[PDB]
Subunit: 150 residues, 2 copies
């Protein structure tokens, strides 16, 4: 356990960001994925409203998550939106996912955020079991609609 | 009322209309004990390059609106848009305002070259589901939403 480190990426961590994206690509089984150019990814990493957390063994990325800050108009305290979370399939069920969620909520707690939220597909049984083990404050059944643009 | 209804995307000198919309949200969502954040905060939010508000106007009266957040992607150079809140004044519902707000919002992000816009509704909110389904979305997915209320 001493071996696992959690790191919040900084603006000079593009190589680690790209490792994480490649982990996403593999774990989510994305086919024919063409990674965006590094200038785009750098600009994203530079944003003050986006935070990436990774899990490291040595400097091998074995999991991570991405999150977005949503400034509120209902409150001065912001919300954080955990977008993606994944752990290397060889390293799953070792407490890594849990440590990532803990660190993430700890970070936004110290930043004085109101809440953090995250979502899973109703079909995704393994994800559901995971989030339900993280002592979330609550869960809600929602319907997600999207419009694919021209 | 189509001839008189106007959709406006708020700009940075539109804080009065932003506040009017928040007051509409408070009414429509029937929020209790709401203390609106100070104007310095709301102004800073309005000034962000990742936040866009559309309002529906009957003359100078806000009768609906929606807020949306930009989410730049790492899977694509094309960003996503997240519609967070949408409401129409109760006196003016079921007259096509909600549809015109969605339409305007998707047209805008289409001009901006976004990949996709998404919006959510609670599964028990049958009337909201009815509404979104009438706007002809590309697809809908069942999702479970978890949150962590921070200390
Ligand atoms: C939908 C809403 C957001 C604004 O949209 P609107 O102006 O009322 O809706 P529109 O007039 O543009 O048209 C949508 C119609 O809603 C649906 N609808 C019609 N009557 C309805 C009713 N009594 N209840 C629910 N949906 C109804 C129709 O399916 C649809 O048009 P259709 O005739 O083609 O089937 C509004 O009703 C509202 O603010 N409700 C309370 C707040 C809310 O739920 N917001 C969304 C979640 S944040
Ligand atoms: C969940 C995930 C994201 C990372 O989690 P992880 O490091 O493997 O999970 P943890 O080891 O921290 O598990 C914590 C708890 O999840 C729960 N859990 C139950 N079933 C599980 C399963 N099939 N997989 C993972 N966690 C499970 C356990 O209670 C577990 O505690 P325990 O081992 O003491 O019983 C990882 O499984 C994953 O990447 N899955 C594929 C991608 C994905 O679905 N991501 C979420 C959607 S974006
Ligand atoms: Cl690479
Ligand atoms: Mg670093
Ligand atoms: Mg367990
Ligand atoms: Mg204006």
């Amino acid at each position: 356990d001493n071996f696992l480190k959690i790191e919040r990426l900084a603006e000079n961590d593009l190589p680690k960001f790209i490792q994480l994206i490649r982990l996403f690509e593999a774990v989510f089984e994305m086919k024919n994925f063409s990674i965006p150019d590094s200038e785009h990814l750098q600009k994203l990493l530079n944003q003050n409203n986006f935070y990436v957390f990774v899990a490291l063994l040595e400097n091998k990325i074995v999991g991570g998550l991405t999150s977005y800050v949503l400034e509120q108009y209902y409150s001065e305290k912001p919300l954080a939106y955990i977008y993606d979370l994944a752990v290397d399939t060889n390293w799953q069920r070792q407490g890594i996912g849990k440590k990532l969620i803990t660190a993430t909520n700890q970070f936004y707690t110290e930043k004085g955020f109101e809440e953090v939220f995250v979502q899973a597909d109703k079909v995704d049984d393994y994800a559901l079991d995971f989030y339900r083990s993280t002592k979330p404050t609550a869960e809600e059944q929602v319907v997600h609609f999207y419009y694919t643009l021209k």
